[PDB]
Ligand binder design. Structure first.
Ligand SMILES: NC(=O)c1ccc[n+]([C@@H]2O[C@H](COP(=O)([O-])OP(=O)(O)OC[C@H]3O[C@@H](n4cnc5c(N)ncnc54)[C@H](O)[C@@H]3O)[C@@H](O)[C@H]2O)c1
Ligand SMILES: NC(=O)c1ccc[n+]([C@@H]2O[C@H](COP(=O)([O-])OP(=O)(O)OC[C@H]3O[C@@H](n4cnc5c(N)ncnc54)[C@H](O)[C@@H]3O)[C@@H](O)[C@H]2O)c1
Lengths: 355, 355
């Protein structure tokens, strides 16, 4: 029923392909990947296409899954749209707002579905927190806060992930937390500030990205947010906190657990699908796709496949299909990048209104 | 040997008096406080003076202890210096850099001691962290981070503490954490940004201060810091974290404990003088002067008294006597206040060059 071609079958694209193939009436018919396509095509018993054009124009393809490096997402999406193929694109959708808007527009004009692969929206704990927030259990929302802070040792080989021009750095490569804040609040920030530096990953054998980033967001409703990322933190933390007038929620990914705190009493909830998934994630942080992420890939590919088969998306995920989550995440990231580069606070209008 | 007059004997000034009277050759001879001076002077068996001038000009006074509301510190210090009296002043020293400089200059010109009451420098765990940092055990320092975040309910009577013009809000009233970052790094920031809002403490019966503040500091050495405060947080945290290349330190005041994390392993140390003091502080946070603070008042008053009796100050505390801790804390606070008021990042030069 739905045939898929995968552009980029490295670590994550190969997993997307394996999990998609598990769904009834879904089939990976081909891949395009100069370095890894031969091996993956043999594993999947599909065709290793000799060029991007051969894949996106193939009659064997109904939907193109894009899982190339972050700076290489645009051409596969634009060419898929030109060939009237549906598109799933991994995060970050692109490394500039102009590129992201061009991608959304191309799919809109071609009349094809375009899904942004913002997988954190599918976390059990994120869905649940959103419902608690919406129902009013923590009152009016006042602020959100994220951290994604750890220590990365020098690596034997330097990969594209550490090069700002290829990955976008922590902000774009780990854009999940920023998209999550905007998803939970349902607003885009009017003013964006970001400070950062390369404090311990500068010199031979290292990339050129900042290894600490400290962002502050101000929203038109008056709500506020802070977001931190980096790879130079010997005090590790990884969380989203939502503060309301009646209580607060923490989605802790490091010491994996959700907490709902009301009247100084705390109730536990799951981040992932089961306590086993949360416990495994926590054990691994203390200590090659982990269980929690495998389950999410299965769920996200199933969502995509069901949409292409005609299902109506639940309201939680509509912004993944209309371009709004992608454009809003990249817009704020672009504003933060400008703020860091130009040593100033940035109005989101500078990004959204530039052209 | 040393006679003290206390201007402002409310909660904290009365405690300063009681603890100072415990030291050999120290005596509180008088107080000035229209509302509470009668009661406290009876308790302390001393004179309740009828005016500030009568206290600062009294032959019964060698040193004036200033513990009035935050906006009422300047005149007692200026007049003490005019009368050649030594001065101890509670934090925040003043609510503007101009006032702080005037106070430091007046005492210098009069040849009297001026001590800034930045009591957090006396915490056992702060002293210990300074020694760990200096010896090199966490490597090169990269960043610092503070939070002082809790929930304050609507109070029966609205006090000066909640009025920005009287307390200076969280930043000045709880300036300890900012002074601590500057003390631990031994540097002042080049650029200061602060965002904030009054998210849940606006309207009849409430003050006019922001109830959330989010500050970012950039130091010319490349070091970075974030600092948060507020009274609208239903996820409470209170800590200082120092991140270095070899390890990190957390001084957690809420779940009261010091942590030194190196090579993935954490070693505990005390925040306060004894495990009893840390245990009791932690137990009280789950739920009038607590043990940890009583010990600090005893220690800080003993330090002042010993200095006035001729002792050489420990290197850790010299900046409480040469004006530097007071001026540097207030300069950064003024820069942050300007950043919040004018919606922009502020260079410290804008503040400190204005003399
Ligand atoms: N949503 C998630 O949880 C998640 C997790 C990991 C990675 N990702 C995303 O997946 C994408 C790929 O990341 P990864 O970890 O698999 O990286 P990877 O380096 O393991 O794989 C990238 C693949 O792209 C191939 N490639 C390079 N240039 C190509 C080109 N012009 N055309 C076709 N293929 C090309 C490479 O040969 C390689 O196989 C990124 O966008 C990344 O952010 C998402
Ligand atoms: N270092 C610390 O740990 C710590 C702790 C608490 C308070 N403080 C500081 O101590 C100072 C006082 O705070 P507090 O908690 O005692 O407040 P408080 O409101 O309990 O006491 C203030 C006192 O000042 C009196 N006063 C008002 N105007 C006066 C005036 N013109 N002249 C003389 N007295 C006047 C008031 O009558 C009252 O007794 C503040 O600067 C505050 O920031 C420091």
């Amino acid at each position: 029923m739905i045939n898929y071609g995968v552009v980029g079958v490295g670590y994550f694209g190969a997993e997307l392909a394996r999990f998609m193939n598990m769904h009834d009436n879904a089939k990976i018919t081909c891949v395009y990947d100069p370095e890894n396509g031969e091996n993956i095509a043999r594993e999947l018993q599909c065709i290793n296409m000799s060029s991007l054009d051969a894949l996106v124009s193939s009659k064997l393809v109904d939907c193109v899954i894009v899982a190339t490096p972050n700076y290489l997402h645009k051409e596969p999406v634009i060419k898929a749209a030109k060939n009237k193929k549906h598109v799933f694109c991994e995060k970050p959708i692109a490394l500039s707002y102009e590129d992201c808007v061009d991608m959304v527009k191309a799919c809109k004009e071609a009349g094809v579905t375009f899904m942004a692969g913002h997988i954190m929206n599918f976390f059990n704990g994120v869905q649940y927190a959103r419902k608690l927030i919406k129902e009013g259990v923590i009152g009016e929302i006042l602020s959100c806060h994220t951290k994604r802070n750890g220590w990365e040792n020098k690596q034997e080989r330097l990969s594209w992930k550490k090069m700002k021009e290829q990955s976008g750095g922590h902000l774009y490569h780990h854009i999940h937390e920023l998209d999550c804040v905007q998803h939970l609040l349902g607003e885009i920030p009017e003013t964006v500030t970001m400070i950062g530096g390369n404090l311990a990953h500068s010199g031979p054998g290292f990339g050129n990205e900042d290894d600490m980033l400290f962002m502050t967001l101000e929203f038109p409703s008056g709500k506020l947010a802070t977001l931190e990322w980096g790879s130079a933190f010997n005090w590790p933390e990884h969380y989203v906190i939502i503060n309301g007038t009646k209580g607060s929620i923490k989605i802790d990914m490091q010491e994996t657990a959700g907490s709902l705190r009301i009247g100084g009493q705390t109730k536990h909830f799951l981040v992932h699908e089961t306590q086993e998934e949360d416990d495994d994630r926590r054990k691994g942080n203390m200590t090659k796709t982990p269980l929690w992420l495998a389950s999410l890939i299965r769920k996200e590919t199933l969502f995509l496949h069901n949409i292409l088969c005609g299902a109506k998306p639940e309201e939680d995920y509509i912004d993944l299909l209309n371009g709004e989550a992608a454009m809003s995440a990249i817009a704020t990231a672009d504003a933060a990048t400008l703020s860091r580069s130009q040593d100033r606070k940035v109005k989101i209008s500078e990004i959204i209104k530039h052209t």
